[PDB]
Symmetry: D2
Subunit: 163 residues, 4 copies
């Protein structure tokens, strides 16, 4: 079974996060190794495997990027832009400079706002593209969002540093 | 050019981290887009690509896991279980979630963190050993497990931030 | 006087980079290493002076601490608990916000919930700071001492918000 | 008194699991929601009581705050503005420790340096806590009031350590 079936969910990008979280807790509770503590050797090993596949599935569907990437994998598509690159370098630069701005926590909030807006716009574009089976456009959105994700991770670092 | 030759480094797992950071700094300085701001569009775009590859190379080499994985790929190896290892990682994760509900969470976290770090250290030494002896199969196994450990290590640092 | 020490004027309004400039100026002057081979009395005095410059810098750098110090100069010290027990309406507001924070993890799309809460708290902080600044400027030390009071809670709430953010991602 | 509120003896030694779940007892009694439709006087009083319980749990749960509160009961009040400056030898140790912390990024192996430094700081903290717990039992308040200072510095150094850790992680 693929990851979507496992949770009884439709194969699509749009996902009820709370539903996934409920379906996962039911599975995790059911396939928890403690439920097989006295089973035969073979049964315990298969159950930890099943428990592992469930965690994998949940980890993959929980995150939009992995989920989108997974959706592409089901189509048989496996994946490995200069101006976008230069912009990301510029943004990275802007980020390293907020901690010298007059109001660092204000500049950080400002920066965080526009990065979140970018992420939102790419996610929306990704969703529309997956909806109309435009896989390569989708693949392109996925790469860019991986950049934005790292960028977002760096601003949270700054939020912890600055403080 | 591979990532190693790009920094003038020997192809091996053993790496001088400070040297890499200094070599990266010189490259990053040299190929920074500002140095090409008035160049022709063709030169600018090729320069940002070179700058991007340098950043990628640096990121790939500075992390032992990515570095080890890169070494495997240079041999034409690319990878896509160990039920007992799985179970133990589940137990460790379980133990980590209890740290909060301890007498001294701050002390139990420290204890747990040293255990995980020692474990990481042992897997890292094993990985180094088999890479040196071209035991790629065993090396790839070490890499997978270390990816588990890394995530675990990430979870303890999350709990440390909770307790601080 | 901390303000004297940095040659700065006694206000809540602070030239931030000027402070860091004065700080390094003093740092590079009362640097204890300069007295590493001196008499112990001389060396320990350098250390005490260096530590006091440290205290002074921390106090002025942080607006809340800066405002408490300005209050302190007026001979005013506050008992920052029975003073807040004096203001139960705000305590209730504090409770509503904490309740609403625990309510984030219990929606669907709770990440956008934290964003909404984080923006609100920030806006609340911006507001109380502006009120505090205007209050200290007009010398209403009482009406500043409760702004500090509210901002102390705000600082605590932001930490709780970070705790929720660290769990969500 | 805060100790009575939770029905604990007046001492430094404290079971977390008790208190933490004993907190929930007073909390689920004086919860202001029980007075949501009451007179305003009764509601605000409930709010004040719930807040005082909150302040009590916080004060007791933290060892440094607990120790300081114990001193406060003896009529003794702190003052880092002048007490810390009265111990230059320890200030030197503070500066040497910070210096040591700033040097870990400089080594050709910054990861393992921090780990050793972190182990060092943790060892120092556990030592001063042991001494504090020891002093407080023998009513040596000022030997304890001095351990509280060092521990307060230790708390700040740990925050500095995590800042450098976050710079690595
Ligand atoms: Ca954060
Ligand atoms: Ca944030
Ligand atoms: Ca740590
Ligand atoms: Ca941290
Ligand atoms: Ca954080």
């Amino acid at each position: 079974m693929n990851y979507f079936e496992l949770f009884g969910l439709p194969i699509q990008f749009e996902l009820d996060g709370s539903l996934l979280s409920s379906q996962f807790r039911a599975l995790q509770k059911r396939f928890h190794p403690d439920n097989f503590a006295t089973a035969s050797e073979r049964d315990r090993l298969m159950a930890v495997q099943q428990a592992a596949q469930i965690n994998d599935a949940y980890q993959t569907l929980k995150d939009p990027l992995r989920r989108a990437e997974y959706l592409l994998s089901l189509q048989g598509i496996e994946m490995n832009d200069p101006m976008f690159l230069m912009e990301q370098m510029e943004l990275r630069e802007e980020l390293e400079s907020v901690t010298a701005c007059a109001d660092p926590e204000a500049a950080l909030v400002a920066f965080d706002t526009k990065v979140t807006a970018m992420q939102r716009h790419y996610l929306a574009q990704l969703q529309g593209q997956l909806a109309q089976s435009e896989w390569l456009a989708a693949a392109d959105q996925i790469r860019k969002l991986k950049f934005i994700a790292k960028l977002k991770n760096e601003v949270e670092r700054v939020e912890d540093q600055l403080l």
